[PDB]
Amino acid sequence: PGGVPWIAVGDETSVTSPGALRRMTSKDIPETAIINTDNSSGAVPSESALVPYIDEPLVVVTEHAITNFTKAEMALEFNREFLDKMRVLSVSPKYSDLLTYVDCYVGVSARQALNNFQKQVPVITPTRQTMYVD
Amino acid sequence: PGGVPWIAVGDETSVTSPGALRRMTSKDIPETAIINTDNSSGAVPSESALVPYIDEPLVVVTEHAITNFTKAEMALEFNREFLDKMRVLSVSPKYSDLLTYVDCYVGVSARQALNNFQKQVPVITPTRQTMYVD
Amino acid sequence: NFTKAEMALEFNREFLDKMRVLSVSPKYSDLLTYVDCYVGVSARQALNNFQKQVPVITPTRQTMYVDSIQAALKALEKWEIDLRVAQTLLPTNVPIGEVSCPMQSVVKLLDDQLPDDSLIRRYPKEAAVALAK
Amino acid sequence: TINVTGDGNVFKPSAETSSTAVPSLSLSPGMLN
Amino acid sequence: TINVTGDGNVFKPSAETSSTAVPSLSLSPGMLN
Amino acid sequence: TINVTGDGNVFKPSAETSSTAVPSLSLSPGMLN
Amino acid sequence: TINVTGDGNVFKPSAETSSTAVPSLSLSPGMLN
């Protein structure tokens, strides 16, 4: 679908409740934080002292977004024979590797996510998402 | 009646002097604090991050005022056919819900409120009151 | 697409509730129905097509839903001008890189040049979160 | 519950955080069937 | 549901059935408190 | 089975029942692979 | 592995094997979110 992950801090008896949805953060899901990203493609460093170590917001990629980026990848592999000659990007990014699946409340606002629970929602961080298009 | 809900400080039923009381506050009666209010009509937000958690004074409504404010709602209902077309205010506020009936000493001074105990006194907070008239 | 139309609304959720309009979100998928029969345009090709979990709706229900989107936008015809105006009053975007400026200072200019009838002045908190969203 | 003219806020426009909400969707009559 | 143009309706105003919705109602502050 | 010259038929054009079949399709080669 | 200057290769351009790799694709903001 779309939107942003949300977590509950009060019983969701009825929709339109005065509270009880909170923005998620990579501190909630340590998987989606930049210390655990697979360093395939070798972007994030290997030296310990240079890693931001700060939690960040999480964002849901839409279903349609996945399709277009994965296509955008396919253009690169048309030159794999030439690319390895330059020795650049010795692995396929596989945009799916960057995503994680989690079933929670997703939505542009708390109010409309509150009614909208979802199942196996792909999520990304604005940092990590940037590391890919970069 | 009318006035402000006064509480007994110290012990239960130890009220003997006007200096042994205190104005109540939404901390004391948490039902009248805006993380609890029935959000019918969708007034207060649903972000857990935009909510005061700050208590406010309590005021007493008068029996001849609820009759007036209920009829205030009756003006809209002569147009609900258009409202639901206009898609506004899907559930009529029903002022009585926002009220809460607690019983205590009620008055507009600790002295005279001492001599004035009552049972089943409706109460409201000024912030919630502004929401309804709005 | 249609479930993206409602997402256009809730960018101003922090203002619709200020307006008591559409007090609970539309949730287009709820109106749908999931059945499984032969689906198509003509019989002699629907006879070759059997699908599951087919989303079926009713034109009256379908008509009703798009109005909820439509009727919602109307109230915000004037509000969305302000946010567009509030942003373009000063550089809030760059082609590249980063720019910085104290937040007290900028909001003083907004207090200084915004039109007198701006809803931004009249609802600073909602405009604050609506911007940051 | 936030201070508009208080401190603590940050105003750092960037390329990666360029604003947009919903310009246009693809609602072709052929596409929607 | 109801057909405006068709027959079977009635326009028979009567002083027993005058028309008022909510012309006004009292809000006097001293008697609200 | 239907008398195109017979009565009982209905002709009420309206904006809700606009006339489209499939004017254009989205077959951009980049987006097809 | 392949001899460019050798024999055996085939050069029959055809209308069904039109050459085209990846011109562009939908990246517009609204329908991307």
Automatic annotation (TrEMBL), chains D, E, F, G:
It is found in: Virion. It comes from the Viruses. This is Mu1. It comes from Mammalian orthoreovirus 3.
